[PDB]
Design a protein around this ligand. Sequence first.
Ligand SMILES: O=C(NO)[C@@H]1[C@H](c2ccccc2)[C@H]1c1ccc(-c2ncc(F)cn2)cc1
Ligand SMILES: [Zn+2]
Ligand SMILES: [Zn+2]
Length: 349
Amino acid sequence: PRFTTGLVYDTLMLKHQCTCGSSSSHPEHAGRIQSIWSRLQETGLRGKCECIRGRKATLEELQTVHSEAHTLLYGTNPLSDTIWNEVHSAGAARLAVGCVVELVFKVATGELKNGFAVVRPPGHHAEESTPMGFCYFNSVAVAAKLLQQRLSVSKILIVDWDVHHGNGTQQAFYSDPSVLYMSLHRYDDGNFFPGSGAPDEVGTGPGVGFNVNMAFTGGLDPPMGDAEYLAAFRTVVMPIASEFAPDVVLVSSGFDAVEGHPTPLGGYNLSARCFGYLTKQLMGLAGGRIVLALEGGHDLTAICDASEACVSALLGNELLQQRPNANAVRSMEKVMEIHSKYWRCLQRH
Ligand SMILES: O=C(NO)[C@@H]1[C@H](c2ccccc2)[C@H]1c1ccc(-c2ncc(F)cn2)cc1
Ligand SMILES: [Zn+2]
Ligand SMILES: [Zn+2]
């Protein structure tokens, strides 16, 4: 077994790719994960991590999040800007889901300490019946549902540091107080992609208070960076996360917030190293039981750097104090004042 860092990856996920085979015309391409897998090798980090085997998720599992009609449509293949290979896409989308499910279940059962899924295509945008933002099935969401249904996990924490809002995951657990969805993302008063994820969307029914949207508003004037996300974790995420006290931690790990992402695909000035410190802060929760799933991040050098930092953090290795900008303070203060009504630590904000 080797109670240490885990990893999952499969070459069969590469075959979800347009027949034209170009990087430029389709940002979500096979090279996104292949570059990461090769970087983890070259840095020797793969040689220290245990590499688990991935499987295709069953239609029965996929329907823990999505409708049957939807799962049959993009899960089985007989005979605009979002691609779909008619031979290999169905299998790849299911492998992405299953790869996370397998890894998450290993880390949850104290077999591995923590893990990192190098999967594609992404998931957090994918709702019950509708695919958007180059997502089809919500791999992270399915893994959480299965943890509920098959390992009786009482309290799951989903952190989503992809720069875009995970509308699908928010939808999946909106009525659920046993799952806490935390999203740090570029919002800009609802005028970014996807456009949803307002701070005041706090959940519904039994799950009122367990949906937190750390929505940055004010735009790229100035752009957000390491200090602003660190302030977010320090004053909003970790406080509410520690109070929730989850048995497992899942991370919709999009690195599109990193430097070198143009103004539709990102526009923020975070560093790869910063995601190492965020991963480190999250490791303190759930007795170390954390697993990171790959979401977005087009720029290859940015995601390869960010992945190297996160995996090293998970192993237990290492590597300033800038103030958050006025817009970050203004954004953070809007979340705390809404979530003061549901969380003890924030009562007086
Ligand atoms: O980052 C993402 N999710 O986490 C999303 C998808 C993406 C994932 C991974 C690599 C590249 C792109 C990114 C994306 C962002 C924006 C848009 C978009 N869609 C419609 C528009 F009119 C304008 N932009 C479409 C897709
Ligand atoms: Zn094409
Ligand atoms: Zn994104």
